[PDB]
Design a protein around this ligand. Structure first.
Ligand SMILES: [Cl-]
Ligand SMILES: [Zn+2]
Length: 317
């Protein structure tokens, strides 16, 4: 009653570069032989091999020491569910569209991906280099217009699934964690009429992000914050060394003035449902909303994040 054994050669991988020769029995599923298995994002764990699969590359989970090392070196994570979440996302993002809008790779709206579109548009306007080879390779392709792998990696690194509501500031925080910001430096001073003054120094990601005001000029002049004594103290920027800065705040009506910022994100909605748009300051003000594009000489809206150019700043206060 035994059926004659039939096999094909396939390759397994965790980085799509280093390949691992395998011989699979076509009477057993991929899952029975490799564990969870994916073909360009599609879950084929429960699929039995097809003749058309011969010679193709399948992603698997890091289930031996060689694969564990290859996966860490490429992705800089050892989260056991990472590859499954990346493939699950990729199965969707490979079907998204990535139109060039005003010279930048955007994303046509789908699956609540507006926060990803404005993040991707923002990255193309600031100086930033990623550390994991996976992000280096995928971001290069995204700049060229093939952003499916990059978007699926953002989702995996942020632990977001396709369709989940995302926050732009949080998303940028994750991407900045995987970028080389080592030389970025920020010095702050906080002045309380009662308690005196206290200087602090921040480095890396914390040197380029601030939550509380959208205006870089106001940050240099001073913003009011609580002091432990109960009074409000004044916090201001003393010194800044970085190629950009990111200023964030809860969404509030805010006026964006041409030539005074690099780009910004706008959020219309509430804590459960909303929509992001991107504003970029070039020869005029362009509003990029996924595949849509409009222009205006002035802009006012519920802004959440503003990016500014920088190199070296020292206060005169
Ligand atoms: Cl890079
Ligand atoms: Zn005080």
């Amino acid at each position: 009653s035994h059926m004659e054994v039939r096999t094909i050669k396939v390759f397994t991988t965790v980085d799509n570069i280093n390949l691992h020769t395998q011989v699979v029995d076509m009477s057993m599923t991929y899952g029975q032989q490799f564990g969870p298995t994916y073909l360009d994002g599609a879950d084929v764990t429960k699929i039995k091999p097809h003749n058309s699969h011969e010679g193709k590359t399948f992603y698997v989970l890091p289930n031996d020491d060689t694969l564990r090392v290859e996966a860490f070196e490429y992705y800089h994570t050892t989260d056991p569910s990472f590859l499954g979440r990346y493939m699950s996302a990729l199965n969707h993002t490979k079907k998204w569209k990535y139109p060039q809008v005003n010279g930048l790779t955007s994303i046509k709206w789908a699956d609540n991906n507006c926060y990803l579109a404005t993040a991707l548009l923002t990255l193309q306007q600031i100086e930033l280099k990623f550390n994991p080879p996976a992000l280096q390779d995928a971001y290069y392709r995204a700049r060229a217009g093939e952003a499916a792998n990059f978007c699926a990696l953002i989702l995996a690194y942020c632990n977001k699934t396709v369709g989940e509501l995302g926050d732009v500031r949080e998303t940028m925080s994750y991407l900045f964690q995987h970028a080389n910001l080592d030389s970025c430096k920020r010095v702050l001073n906080v002045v309380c009429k009662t308690c005196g003054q206290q200087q602090t120094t921040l480095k890396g990601v914390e040197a380029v992000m601030y939550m509380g005001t959208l205006s870089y000029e106001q940050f240099k002049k001073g913003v009011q914050i609580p002091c432990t004594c109960g009074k409000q103290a004044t916090k201001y920027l003393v010194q800044q060394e970085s190629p950009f800065v990111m200023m964030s705040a809860p969404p509030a009506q805010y006026e964006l003035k041409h030539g005074t910022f690099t780009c910004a994100s706008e959020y219309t909605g509430n804590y459960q449902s909303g929509h992001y748009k991107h504003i970029t300051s070039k020869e005029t003000l362009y509003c990029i909303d996924g595949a849509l594009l409009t222009k205006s000489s002035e802009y006012k809206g519920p802004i959440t994040d503003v990016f500014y150019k920088e190199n070296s700043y020292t206060t005169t206060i």
